[PDB]
């Protein structure tokens, strides 16, 4: 309800294209198919493209009018981005080739033409019609069924965020929108569906064309969430590092998250292990990916409070802990001999990113051994956890570049493991973590922020454990910062999509991931790239949920230099919402407003003076924190 008009979600779920972008060819009306009014007579070889204004999803439906040839066809294609808009091919989800366009045979008569799910387009942006026949063809309307997030009111909200930055607000919803277009009818997943036949090591001609479906039931229920809109509509565990907590507090459909945990959580193997990605994906072993799913489950239950659903998985949580131990060796680190991880290089030996997931993972596992009164396990864990500390602070810390190395071999400096680091409290002071986030940012080109690891590239999700790195460094405006810097040129660069965000791209501006060959392959629409929004809500907003559900928070806003912040979201236990204005360095007005029954404390920083309750009960602030306090609205005297 609240800031509706930044929600880009559709209006409905019956879509026409907005505005005609391009016509080719003798094309009467051509905007008829905009919903303006009449029909759209192609007349001969011809085609339109066609803008939807954002990155929309479903099943195309072809109302036709009229045919003059028997051999008559229409064809359409689909692209994310502008740069692949084309009137023979689509945008790439295979290995290597442009995807066939949709074509149908209108020669035969009047109807509406269509294909079904199992043809879903899992996100595009441009739509062209193409007519390849001297035939006078007349159409109605070519319009969309969106089937993104099937279960739910697309502009239904339950968070928001509103600051004095427009531009902040618009990759907030930019998030929000990306992830709500990953969540998809779980009975059209796969796009991969030439996996083991077209590989990188490959050429598809321009003539040649790639055939593409989607019938692969992944999950069980009637939504979950992916990696990728278009591609790879497969569950995959370390994107949902990122992608939970932003379903979270935007549109708390935690459901499609939880049927992609399921999923995850019935592959492990009989000694703990967790899959690299859902089914059909190839049995691999990926160490760090199998931490995610560990990291997840914890995540889950934090935002929803599931004593039921974690009662349910905390054994086999427990084997896959102990999976992960079982890598720990005489140094006190893992020893990971497994290279596959994000699409990134050079994963193995006591790899800094691998050990800081681990130490965040312990600490979630006691936590929640403590939740269970599971009191056993507890011991081993803090040791094991304190030696990683410990080890890896005298093992991989380079004092001179102020970063941790990759291994003990090596003096490359990678982003996800010093990112990492910071996020689980890694490092033995608050001045350390100054020192990486410090360094880090040196590191930034005009594109963003560089993952050495791999190549020259830029990872939007790397970039979102960097953001919370510069948060927990004390460093707000560095991050909103990098937040410019990346994300408006993720959200404005004219060959983007306006409204979801990059899978990654490279540190020359261009579109190219390194791992992938076929550059129209790379997906414009991934949840693990909407790190901001859980970090505008939790960071800069200082809404951080520390209890299950809420049951326990804390109220810590890193404002910057901001002049004006709102933001909000649920659970199952009530409100949580936060909104101040400043100038010159100090609140003109803060307030916030937590559920009932549930006890935080709260830090503002340089910040004297009162929080009055709505019943009237007074706190004083000591060094601009206070405790227990008890939920409800709350403002700053
Ligand atoms: C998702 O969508 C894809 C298509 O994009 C489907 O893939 C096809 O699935 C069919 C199974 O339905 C595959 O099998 C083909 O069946 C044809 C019929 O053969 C007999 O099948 C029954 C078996 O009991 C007989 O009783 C009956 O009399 C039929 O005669 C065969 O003619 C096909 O031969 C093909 O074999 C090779 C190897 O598979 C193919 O590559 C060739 O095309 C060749 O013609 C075949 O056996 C079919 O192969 C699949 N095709 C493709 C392109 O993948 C998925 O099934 C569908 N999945 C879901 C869940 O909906
Ligand atoms: C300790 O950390 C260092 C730094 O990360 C790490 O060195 C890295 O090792 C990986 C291998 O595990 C290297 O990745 C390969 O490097 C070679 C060049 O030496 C390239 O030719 C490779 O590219 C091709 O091959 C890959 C498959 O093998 C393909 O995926 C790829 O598309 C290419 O076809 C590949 O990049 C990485 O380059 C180095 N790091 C640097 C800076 O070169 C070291 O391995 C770690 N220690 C241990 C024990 O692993
Ligand atoms: C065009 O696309 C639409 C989707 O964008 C299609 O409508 C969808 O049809 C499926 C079934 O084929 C529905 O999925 C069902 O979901 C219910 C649960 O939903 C109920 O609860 C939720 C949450 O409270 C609520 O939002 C719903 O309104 C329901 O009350 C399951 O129990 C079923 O087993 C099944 O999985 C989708 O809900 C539905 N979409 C919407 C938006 O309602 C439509 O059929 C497509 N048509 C064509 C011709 O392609
Ligand atoms: C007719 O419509 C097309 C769009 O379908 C207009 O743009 C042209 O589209 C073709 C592809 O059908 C482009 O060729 C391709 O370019 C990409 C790089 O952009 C390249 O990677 C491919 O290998 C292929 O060469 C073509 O460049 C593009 N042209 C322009 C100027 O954008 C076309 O302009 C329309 N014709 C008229 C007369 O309006
Ligand atoms: C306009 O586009 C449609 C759809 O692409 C064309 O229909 C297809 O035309 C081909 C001829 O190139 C038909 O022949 C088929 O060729 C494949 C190899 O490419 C072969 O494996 C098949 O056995 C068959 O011989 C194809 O059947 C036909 N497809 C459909 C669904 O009708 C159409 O010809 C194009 N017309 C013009 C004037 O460009
Ligand atoms: C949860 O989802 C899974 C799929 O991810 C469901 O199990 C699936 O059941 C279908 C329907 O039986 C299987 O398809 C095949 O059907 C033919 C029909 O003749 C049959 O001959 C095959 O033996 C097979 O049953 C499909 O293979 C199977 N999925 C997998 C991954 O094997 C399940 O029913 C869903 N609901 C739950 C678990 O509550
Ligand atoms: C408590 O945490 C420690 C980590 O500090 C766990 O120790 C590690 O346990 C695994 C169990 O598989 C050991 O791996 C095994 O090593 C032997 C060689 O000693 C090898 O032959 C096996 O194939 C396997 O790889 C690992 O070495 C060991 N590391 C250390 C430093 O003790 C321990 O498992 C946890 N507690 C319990 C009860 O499991
Ligand atoms: C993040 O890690 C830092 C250290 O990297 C944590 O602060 C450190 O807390 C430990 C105790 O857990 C302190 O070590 C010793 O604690 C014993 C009591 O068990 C005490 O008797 C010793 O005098 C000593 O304090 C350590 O000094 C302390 N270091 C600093 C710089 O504060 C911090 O608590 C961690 N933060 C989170 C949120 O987990
Ligand atoms: C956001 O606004 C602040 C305030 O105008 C910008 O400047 C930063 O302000 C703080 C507090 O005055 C400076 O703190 C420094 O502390 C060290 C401690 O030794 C002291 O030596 C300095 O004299 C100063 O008091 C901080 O250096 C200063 N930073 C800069 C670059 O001016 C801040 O830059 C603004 N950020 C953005 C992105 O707009
Ligand atoms: C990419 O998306 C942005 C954001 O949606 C577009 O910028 C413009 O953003 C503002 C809202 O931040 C919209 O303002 C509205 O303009 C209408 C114009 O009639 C006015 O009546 C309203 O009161 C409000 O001021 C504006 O519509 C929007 N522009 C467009 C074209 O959507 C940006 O233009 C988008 N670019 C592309 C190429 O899609
Ligand atoms: C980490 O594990 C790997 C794999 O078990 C170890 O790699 C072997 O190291 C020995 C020396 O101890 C070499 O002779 C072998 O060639 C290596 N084999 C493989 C498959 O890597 C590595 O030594 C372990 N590191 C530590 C510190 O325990
Ligand atoms: C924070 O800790 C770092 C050490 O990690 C201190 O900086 C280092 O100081 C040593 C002094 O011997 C130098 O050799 C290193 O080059 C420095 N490292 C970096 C990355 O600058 C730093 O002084 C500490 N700061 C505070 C305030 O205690
Ligand atoms: C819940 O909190 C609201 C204030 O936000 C208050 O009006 C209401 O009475 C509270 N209910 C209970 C049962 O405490």
Redesign the pocket.
């Known amino acids: 309800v609240p800031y509706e008009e930044y929600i880009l979600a559709p209006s409905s779920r019956d879509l026409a294209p907005a505005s005609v972008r391009q016509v080719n060819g003798s094309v009467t009306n051509a905007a008829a198919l905009t919903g303006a009014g009449g029909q759209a007579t192609f007349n001969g070889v011809s085609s339109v493209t066609y803008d939807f204004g954002i990155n929309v999803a479903g099943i195309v439906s072809v109302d036709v009018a009229s045919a003059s040839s028997e051999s008559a066809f229409i064809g359409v294609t689909f692209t994310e981005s502008s740069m692949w808009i084309s009137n023979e091919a689509c945008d790439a989800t295979q290995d290597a080739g442009l995807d066939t366009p949709l074509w149908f045979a209108v020669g035969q008569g009047a109807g509406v033409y269509s294909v079904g799910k199992k043809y879903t387009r899992g996100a595009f942006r441009y739509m062209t019609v193409v007519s390849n026949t001297t035939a006078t063809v007349s159409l109605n309307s070519v319009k969309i069924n969106y089937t993104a997030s099937p279960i739910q009111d697309l502009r239904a909200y339950t968070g928001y965020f509103h600051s004095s930055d427009e531009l902040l607000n618009r990759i907030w919803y930019a998030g929000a929108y990306t992830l709500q277009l990953c969540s998809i009818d779980p009975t059209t997943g796969d796009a991969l569906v030439g996996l083991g036949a077209i590989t990188?090591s490959e050429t598809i001609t321009l003539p040649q064309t790639d055939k593409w479906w989607t019938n692969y039931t992944i999950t069980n229920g009637s939504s979950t969430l992916t990696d990728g809109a278009k591609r790879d509509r497969l569950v995959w565990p370390g994107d949902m590092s990122i992608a939970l907590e932003s379903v979270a507090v935007s549109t708390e459909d935690l459901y499609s998250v939880r049927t992609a945990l399921e999923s995850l959580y019935a592959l492990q193997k009989a000694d703990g292990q967790l899959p690299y990605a859902g089914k059909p994906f190839y049995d691999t072993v990926s160490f760090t990916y199998h931490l995610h799913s560990l990291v997840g489950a914890a995540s889950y239950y934090q935002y929803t409070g599931d004593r039921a659903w974690l009662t349910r998985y905390w054994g086999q949580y427990k084997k896959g802990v102990q999976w992960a131990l079982s890598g720990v060796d005489s140094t006190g680190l893992a020893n990971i001999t497994a290279?596959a991880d994000w699409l990134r290089?050079?994963?193995?030996?006591h790899?800094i990113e691998a050990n800081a997931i681990l130490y965040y993972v312990l600490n979630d596992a006691i936590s929640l051994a403590q939740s269970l009164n599971d009191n056993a396990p507890i011991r081993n864990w803090t040791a094991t956890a304190a030696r990683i500390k410990t080890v890896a602070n005298e093992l991989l810390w380079d004092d001179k570049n102020g970063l941790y190395?990759?291994?003990?071999?090596?003096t490359?400096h990678?982003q996800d493991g010093n990112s990492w680091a910071v996020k689980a409290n890694l490092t033995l002071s608050a001045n350390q973590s100054a020192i990486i986030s410090e360094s880090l940012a040196a590191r930034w080109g005009p594109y963003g922020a560089p993952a050495?690891?791999a190549?020259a590239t830029v990872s939007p999700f790397i970039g979102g454990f960097e953001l919370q790195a510069h948060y927990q460094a004390g460093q707000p405006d560095r991050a909103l910062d990098l937040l410019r810097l990346q994300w408006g040129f993720m959200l404005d660069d004219p060959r983007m999509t306006n409204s979801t965000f990059i899978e990654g791209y490279s540190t020359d501006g261009s579109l190219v991931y390194?791992?992938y060959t076929n550059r129209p392959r790379v997906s414009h629409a991934h949840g693990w790239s909407t790190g901001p929004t859980s970090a505008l809500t939790i960071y800069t907003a200082g809404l951080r949920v520390t209890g299950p559900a809420g049951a326990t928070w804390l109220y810590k806003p890193q404002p910057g230099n901001l002049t004006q912040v709102e933001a909000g979201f649920s659970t199952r236990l009530g409100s949580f919402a936060s909104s101040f204005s400043r100038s010159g360095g100090r609140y003109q007005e803060l307030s916030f407003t937590t559920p009932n029954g549930t006890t935080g404390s709260v830090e503002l920083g340089d910040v004297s003076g009162q929080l009055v309750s709505e019943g009237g009960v007074k706190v004083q602030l000591v060094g601009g924190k206070a405790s227990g306090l008890q939920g409800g609205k709350w403002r700053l005297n």
Do not use: K, R, V, W
């Open positions: 990188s290279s290089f050079g994963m193995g030996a790899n190395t990759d291994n003990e071999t090596t490359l990678p050495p690891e190549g390194a791992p």
